[model samples]
Target chain A: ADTIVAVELDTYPNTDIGDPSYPHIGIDIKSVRSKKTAKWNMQNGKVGTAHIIYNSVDKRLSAVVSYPNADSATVSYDVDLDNVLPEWVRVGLSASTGLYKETNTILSWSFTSKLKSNSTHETNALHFMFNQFSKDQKDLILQGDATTGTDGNLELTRVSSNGSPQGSSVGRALFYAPVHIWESSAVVASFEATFTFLIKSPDSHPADGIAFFISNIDSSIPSGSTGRLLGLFPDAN
Target chain B: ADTIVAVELDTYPNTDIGDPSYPHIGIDIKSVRSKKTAKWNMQNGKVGTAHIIYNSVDKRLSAVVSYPNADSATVSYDVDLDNVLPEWVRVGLSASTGLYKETNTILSWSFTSKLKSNSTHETNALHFMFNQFSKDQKDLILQGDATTGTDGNLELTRVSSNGSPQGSSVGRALFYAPVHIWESSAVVASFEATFTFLIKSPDSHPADGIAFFISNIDSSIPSGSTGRLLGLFPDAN
Candidate 1:
């Protein structure tokens, strides 16, 4: 899925030798997936349009402004959903007029429905991979009661027969370098990692299960992360 | 002269999830050369930085937002001033959630300026050049009293033989194709054009001066565009 944003500037209204302040400019952004509608009108006597969509459905909020006329400028944006985005989204517009006698105006505005497929990344995502081995676990950051041991395959177990399970069972391991992954350049960034693991509950009852997380924090394990807290947060519930 | 425009989107905050709405996003754009000052605050809690300069000299307006943090997405714009920009300009930031419920915070924000030379276009500007030449004028549009005559050199005279001034004196000529010259890659578009001409007066006075115009309008002239209007606008004052 994709999100596209666009805005148009009507006029500068400054006829001079030196620099003149820019005209007023604003935007109105929303997820068409939400089925909510909004309206905008520019000073130049034209209507604006705003359309939002998730997948391929369409909803719109628009205004009127004559097309193919002079004194107009356009700013457009395209967002690929594969990249990091908030769960629910919000968008809108604002304006500031500098050193101009009167405020600048928006010529027209609108959002139309568009279909976009998931982005395909050509580069391999595996900066490094691990198999059922030992030496591979050497260059990693381990915290709490976590340790690497093997029976038939390597395992990262927070507790075996040691450590306080019901109250103090918390552990974590992290990569050496922060993962430099994101839709950073001309193309949207995407990734897929494959691996296999087995979780055998201690004896018959597993006091607390495991948690998988991706965070900006590095190498630091939160204290008081016992039971369901999972060492990911100091007070994680 | 070229005018370049750009915009950046960092984060989208939806106050309520599951049927929530998006806040407004807009731009405060201007030429820094105009010596005007305005401030902006992002919900994410960061001061934005504004830097504007022309050819030489320095201008400033800036803010701060934390970098390398989660909950951040960027939509960066790099506009090539070659398209259309004003002489003196003002630029800043704009947003919608002016009186919203929740607080929007920008972790950190700052601007680091780097010096670069003026944009140098690689492609030659002249698609075709002429000096009292034929064929070149053949593929052009000629309207009104425009007539070509040769007397050692080609001349485009709007009126001759002392035609009554301010009436029956409108004339126009234009190139068929707009010189389409610019880099089609990552950079914004840029171009340069060069030409030379001379004007002579009839009798003791020049009726109305000529005008050089560039517009999307094609093969059309405004009616009653006599005298100082130059056939470009009404009333040639």
Candidate 2:
């Protein structure tokens, strides 16, 4: 069957689909059997306005039809698009007279939609400036010698008198709260991150560089990994 | 000065602010002078409904006021929220009678909004399944010896006679068109990506692993970078 969704101002009572006896508005999904309908009076020689709103967050599809003389009707239905339609689909309008001679006209039409992920979680805004770390390191997780330096800058690896990092050492600093990255397996959130840092070494040659990464919450430094491995991978794995 | 944006239903014309002589609906930003106004008839002992809509994409703020007798009026203005308000904002309603002893009653109200970024780019959906690579590798960029295997699977690294990957070799495959990740500096698009692959090694131990990444369109293979470096970083840095 062809997948379909539509809002119809149906006048005829199709006994096969169980339509109302009077003219009505309906919310249709996949079939002519409207999931919900509201009685409407389709007056001749008069123009009517209609608004069809589909809120993906609430999975509610609502229709409002109003006439010039303050006459109005409303109908709504709950549907999950993920279950009924493919990710990619087309939008269009159609009309059928069905053996009766009647004219249907569309004077003007406009469509607007805001695409959103289907996650219930609120998108918490995360933005902060840190000139210095607090004494207790609030809202932060520090492990393996990660701490605030005397100058208040974050110190990942402590240095020695020769200005070289200590051997066989590792440091990790992370935000205390896990960021909402992917709403589902398919829908990923958009985000921006900015930070400033300074890396200095007393020697002319720098042994290794630093990397910014995202990993599982339970991830830990690989065993016996140091230097060029950057504490990321296990030794000889 | 505090930043503010509001809609006001003015009954008495305040000459100081250049308000309309009759009751009117106005959109105010920061100051008492309204950016736009529409004359309204505030009937006694009657109810009125108002709808305020702000389209962030178009930078348009619109208001529609209607009464039960089919009387309606509309007003709109163009204002960018980025310039007039902070990212975080509070919403509420207030009214001042200005010593006239007029009472305002609210029976019910509702608010609905959809947050969107300010980007004008159309979100083009990209989805395709490749059972076999086409002769020209349409919509794909293959570099550094990346090719299709005999079984039609993507081959990032080819194997030698002994099943070991060729030495000093690199491979990269990327979508030809850049994905629209961010709409603005502060807003990002939600997305989903999924792919399947197989990694096999002739030896009992794997020498290196593959990585999936997002980078600039002009990015290329680093000079003399291979093996443990994964052709990402330069030979010596």
DockQ for every model, please: 0.01, 0.01
Q: Name the weakest run of 10 consecutive residues (lDDT summed) in model 2 chain A.
A: A121-130
Of candidate 1 chain A, the 10-residue stretch with the lowest lDDT total is: A55-64
Chain A TM-score values for every predicted structure, listed in order = 0.41, 0.49
Each candidate's iRMS in angstroms? 17.7, 19.3
Model 2, TM vs. native: 0.29
For A1-237, candidate 2 gives per-residue lDDT tens digits of 234565666655654546676767777665556689899766543556666665445677677777777768988899766566543333322332212322232332333323223334322122222334433544346655455534434555555544445544555555543332222322332322223334333333232323233344444555543443343434322
How high is the CA lDDT of each candidate model? 0.28, 0.46
Q: Pick the candidate with the highest TM-score.
A: 2
**Model 2, native contacts kept:** 0.00
What would you estimate as the lDDT of candidate 2? 0.46
| Chain B alone vs. reference chain B, TM-score for every model | 0.40, 0.49
Residue-pair clashes per prediction, in order, are 62, 0
TM-score of each: 0.25, 0.29
